Amino acid sequence: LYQKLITSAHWKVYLAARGVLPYVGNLITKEIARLLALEEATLSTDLQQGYALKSLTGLLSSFVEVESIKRHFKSRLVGTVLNGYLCLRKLVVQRTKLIDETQDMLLEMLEDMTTGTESETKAFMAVCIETAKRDYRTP
């Protein structure tokens, strides 16, 4: 229902103006953190592990697929996408097919955001420094 109601870029931009993008980014970060704090538990396998994560990432990709929102929110989404992708790469035992699809979508979004003016890029590099500040493999 939600994706059907915002199929027009008109309402995607409206929601982005209201601040939906930071909300979905924070939700993705919280879900990935829950998965990270969950791999310390047993190897309990859950069939629907990552449906919320995959759906939130799909929503973020749908919003980013509009040029203006991408322009205005690249610098604000690069940090959260980097953090999410790095934290998802740590997953080994709890890595589910849906988690793999989410990580691939985050990689595609990050690559889509790396592209930009040298300024925007150097700004994204500054973000990368903060992400590394936030382990010999993940950095």
């Binding site: 190897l43 309990s44 396998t45 069939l47 629907q48 080994v92 035992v93 589910t96 097919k97």
Partner: protein, 285 residues
């Protein structure tokens, strides 16, 4: 469990029976029964080996001693007809190797010319070929194969026939889903790929449990209506439905088939896949 009931592949050496099991089993005891015992060559030592390697065919392990773990060595007295091998800890095994490692061989006068099994002519022990009919006196009585290296092997290396005894194996074990031990990143990658495939299978079957969910939701609604739909005598009578069972509410029977049959089969498949996935995750961790 009779070992014969869970073997899916078997190969032999002159002293070893190497077997692939239908699946991984946790084994606590092995009993060996010995029938038709001949006094000329009697087993003195049995070694039991195992591994939990997944193989397509047991021949891949036949001549690979470094791939086997020794579970137990047992000694027999001359003419012993039953051996109980109590393992100090249960072993998890998808393959077994039983080795007859030493013998109380009774020496005899092999110098005497042997008798041809086909024409009864006298045959010299070397080369052991009948000069009258060409029959080889050292051929396996069961499969006619000739061992080149050993003229009097304890087992036929082709078919496992033993002229000195018959061996029956009874495994006090239980079926236990398990995977091959992970060694190096090569096996780590294999295990990860297996985990991914099994998770895909688990996702597919989940859907089956959930596919029957709306059907059960619906049949339950109809059954709650408690309508006295008059008995419908369908022309098709392939199913053996007795009058009383035929008169049972169709939805009730439909519910019983959907849940106890279909939902239970799907849930059993899903639980087996989940247990195997948990074992793979535990090994990887």
């Amino acid at each position: 469990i009779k070992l014969s009931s869970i073997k899916v592949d078997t190969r032999y050496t002159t002293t070893q029976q190497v077997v692939k099991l239908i699946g991984s089993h946790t084994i606590s005891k092995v009993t060996v029964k010995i029938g038709d015992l001949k006094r000329t060559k009697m087993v003195r030592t049995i070694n039991l080996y195992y591994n939990n390697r997944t193989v397509q065919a047991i021949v891949e392990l036949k001549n690979k001693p470094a791939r086997w773990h020794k579970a137990k060595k047992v000694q027999l007295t001359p003419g012993q007809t039953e051996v109980k091998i109590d393992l100090p800890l249960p072993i998890v095994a998808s393959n077994l190797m039983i080795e007859f490692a030493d013998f109380y061989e009774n020496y005899q006068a092999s110098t005497e010319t042997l008798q041809c099994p086909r024409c009864s002519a006298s045959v010299p022990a070397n080369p052991g070929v009948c000069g009258n009919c060409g029959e080889n006196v050292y051929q396996c009585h069961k499969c006619r194969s000739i061992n080149y290296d050993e003229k009097d092997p304890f087992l036929c290396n082709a078919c496992g026939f033993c002229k000195y005894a018959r061996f029956d194996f009874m495994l006090y074990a239980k079926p236990c889903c398990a995977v091959d031990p992970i060694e190096n990143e090569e096996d780590r990658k294999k295990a990860v790929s297996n985990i991914n495939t099994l998770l895909d299978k688990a996702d597919r079957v989940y859907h089956q449990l959930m596919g029957h969910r709306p059907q059960l939701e619906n049949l339950l609604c109809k059954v709650n209506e408690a309508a006295p739909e008059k008995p419908q005598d369908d022309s098709g009578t392939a199913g053996g439905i007795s009058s009383t069972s035929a008169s049972v509410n169709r939805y009730i029977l439909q519910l019983a088939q959907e849940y106890c049959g279909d939902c239970k089969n799907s849930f059993d498949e899903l639980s087996k896949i989940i247990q195997k996935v948990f074992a793979s995750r535990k090994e990887l961790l």
